């Protein structure tokens, strides 16, 4: 197996696990492989010469493949999914295209509201990431074709599957869950807004996701994510 080295940002001391869901995205991709890998946080302030010289153009988060420096998120998630493939490693694309697509406008939603200093818009905006996470709600409720006519007691016609997709984490949950979680904890310490607890389908979903390894130790703590927003959501 080629080298595989990931560089992600580093936090507010210039080391620890930062507010970087770029990077914890493709910590969770290649988690969920099982391939061997390392990671190394970068302190952009302090860069060391090994990481100017594999990547000069300073973009974050990189890749390094055996010789080979990969930048763009989203092109080194395809680029891993393609080459860490079937027999060796299990593939992580979703089934469902609508999975890769759920709950993709809420982060907007929130860095509107998060932002905003007009007090006329506030309810607006509240309601718009309200809306846009309902939205999410109502897809994790659906069931999905694999749960075509099953049935669960008091609960008919309603998803009981644990993640986007099914019941195991995809390339769909690796992309959303950071940025959700950054919405709320950043809302819930600044605004005191919190997703509804009659968003069931929401609640469950990151009941079950906040408890896998996969997200849990790729985190940053809730400190550090309320520190890198102080100066916006103030």
Same mark, same amino acid.
């Given at each position: 197996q080629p080298q595989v080295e990931l560089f992600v940002k580093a936090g507010s001391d210039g080391a620890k696990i930062g507010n970087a869901p770029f990077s914890q995205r493709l910590f969770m991709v290649l988690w969920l492989k099982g391939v061997t890998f390392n990671v190394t946080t970068v302190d952009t302030k302090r860069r060391t010469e090994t990481v100017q010289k594999l990547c000069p153009g300073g973009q974050l988060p990189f890749l390094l493949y055996g010789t080979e420096v990969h930048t763009d998120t989203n092109k080194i998630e395809e680029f891993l999914e393609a080459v860490l493939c079937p027999p060796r490693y299990p593939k &992580?694309?979703? &089934?469902?295209?609508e999975s890769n697509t759920a709950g993709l406008d809420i982060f907007a939603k929130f860095s509107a509201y998060i932002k @905003?200093? @007009?007090?006329? &818009?506030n309810d607006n905006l509240e309601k718009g990431l309200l809306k846009a996470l309902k939205v999410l709600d109502n897809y994790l409720t659906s069931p999905l074709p694999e749960e075509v006519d099953e049935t669960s007691a008091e609960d008919e016609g309603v998803s009981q599957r644990k993640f986007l997709d099914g019941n195991e984490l995809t390339l769909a949950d690796c992309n959303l869950l950071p940025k959700l979680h950054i919405v709320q904890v950043v809302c819930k310490k600044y605004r005191g807004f919190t997703i509804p607890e009659a968003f069931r389908g929401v609640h469950r979903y990151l009941s079950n996701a906040y408890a896998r390894e996969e997200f849990a130790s790729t985190c940053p703590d809730d400190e550090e994510i309320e520190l890198a927003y102080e100066q916006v959501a103030k």
């Amino acid at each position: 197996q080629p080298q595989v080295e990931l560089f992600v940002k580093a936090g507010s001391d210039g080391a620890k696990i930062g507010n970087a869901p770029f990077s914890q995205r493709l910590f969770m991709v290649l988690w969920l492989k099982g391939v061997t890998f390392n990671v190394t946080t970068v302190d952009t302030k302090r860069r060391t010469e090994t990481v100017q010289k594999l990547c000069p153009g300073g973009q974050l988060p990189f890749l390094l493949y055996g010789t080979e420096v990969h930048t763009d998120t989203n092109k080194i998630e395809e680029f891993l999914e393609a080459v860490l493939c079937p027999p060796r490693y299990p593939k &992580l694309a979703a &089934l469902n295209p609508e999975s890769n697509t759920a709950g993709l406008d809420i982060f907007a939603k929130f860095s509107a509201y998060i932002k @905003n200093s @007009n007090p006329a &818009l506030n309810d607006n905006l509240e309601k718009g990431l309200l809306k846009a996470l309902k939205v999410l709600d109502n897809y994790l409720t659906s069931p999905l074709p694999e749960e075509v006519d099953e049935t669960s007691a008091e609960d008919e016609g309603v998803s009981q599957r644990k993640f986007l997709d099914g019941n195991e984490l995809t390339l769909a949950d690796c992309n959303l869950l950071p940025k959700l979680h950054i919405v709320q904890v950043v809302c819930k310490k600044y605004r005191g807004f919190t997703i509804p607890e009659a968003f069931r389908g929401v609640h469950r979903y990151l009941s079950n996701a906040y408890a896998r390894e996969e997200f849990a130790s790729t985190c940053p703590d809730d400190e550090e994510i309320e520190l890198a927003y102080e100066q916006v959501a103030k």
